Amino acid sequence: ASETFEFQAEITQLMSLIINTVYSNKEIFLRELISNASDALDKIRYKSLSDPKQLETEPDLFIRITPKPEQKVLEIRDSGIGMTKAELINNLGTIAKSGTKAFMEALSAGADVSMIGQFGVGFYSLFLVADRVQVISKSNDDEQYIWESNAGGSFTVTLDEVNERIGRGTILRLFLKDDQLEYLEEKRIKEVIKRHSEFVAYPIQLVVTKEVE
Amino acid sequence: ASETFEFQAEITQLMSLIINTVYSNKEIFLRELISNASDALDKIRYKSLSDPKQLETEPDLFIRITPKPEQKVLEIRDSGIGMTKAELINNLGTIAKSGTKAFMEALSAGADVSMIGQFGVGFYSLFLVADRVQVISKSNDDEQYIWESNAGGSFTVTLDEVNERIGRGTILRLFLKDDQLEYLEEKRIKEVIKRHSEFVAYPIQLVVTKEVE
Ligand SMILES: C=CCNC1=C2C[C@@H](C)C[C@H](OC)[C@H](O)[C@H](C)/C=C(\C)[C@@H](OC(N)=O)[C@@H](OC)/C=C/C=C(/C)C(=O)NC(=C(C)C1=O)C2=O
Ligand SMILES: C=CCNC1=C2C[C@@H](C)C[C@H](OC)[C@H](O)[C@H](C)/C=C(\C)[C@@H](OC(N)=O)[C@@H](OC)/C=C/C=C(/C)C(=O)NC(=C(C)C1=O)C2=O
Ligand SMILES: [Cl-]
Ligand SMILES: [Cl-]
Numbered sequence A, B: 001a002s003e004t005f006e007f008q009a010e011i012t013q014l015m016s017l018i019i020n021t022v023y024s025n026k027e028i029f030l031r032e033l034i035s036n037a038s039d040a041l042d043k044i045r046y047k048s049l050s051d052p053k054q055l056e057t058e059p060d061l062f063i064r065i066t067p068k069p070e071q072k073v074l075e076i077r078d079s080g081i082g083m084t085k086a087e088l089i090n091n092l093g094t095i096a097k098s099g100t101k102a103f104m105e106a107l108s109a110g111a112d113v114s115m116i117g118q119f120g121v122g123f124y125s126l127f128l129v130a131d132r133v134q135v136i137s138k139s140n141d142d143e144q145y146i147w148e149s150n151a152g153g154s155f156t157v158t159l160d161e162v163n164e165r166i167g168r169g170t171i172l173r174l175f176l177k178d179d180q181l182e183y184l185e186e187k188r189i190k191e192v193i194k195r196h197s198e199f200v201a202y203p204i205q206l207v208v209t210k211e212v213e
Helices: A009-019 A028-047 A085-094 A100-109 A113-119 A122-128 A178-184 A186-196 B009-019 B028-047 B085-094 B100-109 B113-119 B122-128 B178-184 B186-196
Strands: A002-006 A063-068 A073-078 A130-138 A145-149 A154-159 A169-176 A204-211 B002-006 B063-068 B073-078 B130-138 B145-149 B154-159 B169-176 B204-211
Touching: A002 A085, A009 A100, A009 A122, A028 A063, A028 A073, A028 A113, A028 A122, A028 A169, A028 A186, A063 A178, A063 A186, A085 A130, A085 A145, A085 A154, A100 A113, A113 A122, A122 A130, A169 A178, A178 A186, A186 A204, B002 B085, B009 B100, B009 B122, B028 B063, B028 B073, B028 B113, B028 B122, B028 B169, B028 B186, B063 B178, B063 B186, B085 B130, B085 B145, B085 B154, B100 B113, B113 B122, B122 B130, B169 B178, B178 B186, B186 B204
Parallel strands: A063 A204, B063 B204
Antiparallel strands: A002 A154, A063 A073, A073 A169, A130 A145, A130 A169, A145 A154, A204 B204, B002 B154, B063 B073, B073 B169, B130 B145, B130 B169, B145 B154
16 A cells, blocks of 8 residues: 655645756756765764664665666665655655755756755756656665655655565666656766766666677 | 475485586586576467467566676576466476486486486576575466575475566576586676577576776
């Protein structure tokens, strides 16, 4: 059973701006997702300074990107802290975010969309490039859940009986728009990582499917 | 809940021979799995000659190999016909197989283990290289199930709430033995495919994880 939740009204309004935007530097979505992944990795590592047990659900600390061209999907996985059900509900849409209005007011004054991570709302940049997202997450303190949104006014949260087990962490599953299929390509991906994600403390893995010739 | 089933006695005896064998040409396990994958692909394609609907759960016809080095696992996936629960139970261990005794009698006369596919029992060759297998399968006619064995006298079958959805087909998940970790390596894999699987009608995909430098 899927519980449904309403987005706070300014978040809806923010996704609607970003979804319907001509902006020409959309690659920054990947800088934001990598940077969030790194934040989550920092938190599990930090937590484990005084609780080493927390690392054992998933000893390896990594960021992994998996294009799925046949489904038009790009997945960004991390083994960071993960989010519980209550965390997905509170933090991904139901409660007002501090920088949402301020970011939109800056945008309409001329600010580059790039500044979105500085306003602390950079997760919503994934709608530049995607018209649907699943956030699949496994916190040490809860079962695996799927949060899903298509940028309308509500999102669902659902106990995960459908995807592979994460030992610990999060998978951002993006349903790319038809004009944004360039982020399915290996060359394009490495290039965006080189430009925007030079200083990442964690290995960044790219999963590539080759045909044997 | 996992139902448990008993292997027919000669199948147990066959796995026990293969598990405990010095034989020096174990790579043939991959020839057998690829060839089984191709058999399953033939059957779905054939079925769909008079029922094109059957293809739509998974339009693409492929064999995909995914080493998972960190788990010491090798997965062989196909989008073939898949097997229902009853098929996994009947065909993977509970009923006597025609070539089981005859293959063992040949083995003890001097036959190469390679002849195993000729006796129609080549699936059990995966125990040359693995001490545990999951067969995860999705037939158009049933839900996704996991069959599991560790070469003892019984196996389990379990409704799958734990792995990614197959649209249609089968994943052979092999828990490699510590001395057989060479089949985790890309170079080794392509080499075994070149030698034994030259004439396969279907694309063979290798999934490779690279670190971005
Ligand atoms: C205020 C600083 C504290 N951290 C941050 C917060 C506030 C809280 C949400 C923190 C979270 O609370 C449970 C968690 O601690 C984890 C670690 C979540 C992640 C960082 C993210 O994913 C993973 N797991 O890869 C991400 O969703 C996938 C979250 C997106 C959230 C919003 C909306 C966002 O756009 N930007 C935010 C960033 C960037 C933050 O760093 C942000 O809001
Ligand atoms: C007698 C000729 C008919 N086909 C074969 C049979 C008899 C039946 C089992 C057929 C099956 O019935 C439901 C199915 O029709 C599908 C197609 C199953 C696959 C071919 C296999 O996997 C996929 N899906 O990749 C494989 O398990 C993973 C099966 C292993 C079975 C045994 C034990 C074996 O060692 N060798 C066999 C081979 C090779 C056969 O071709 C075999 O026994
Ligand atoms: Cl806030
Ligand atoms: Cl038979």
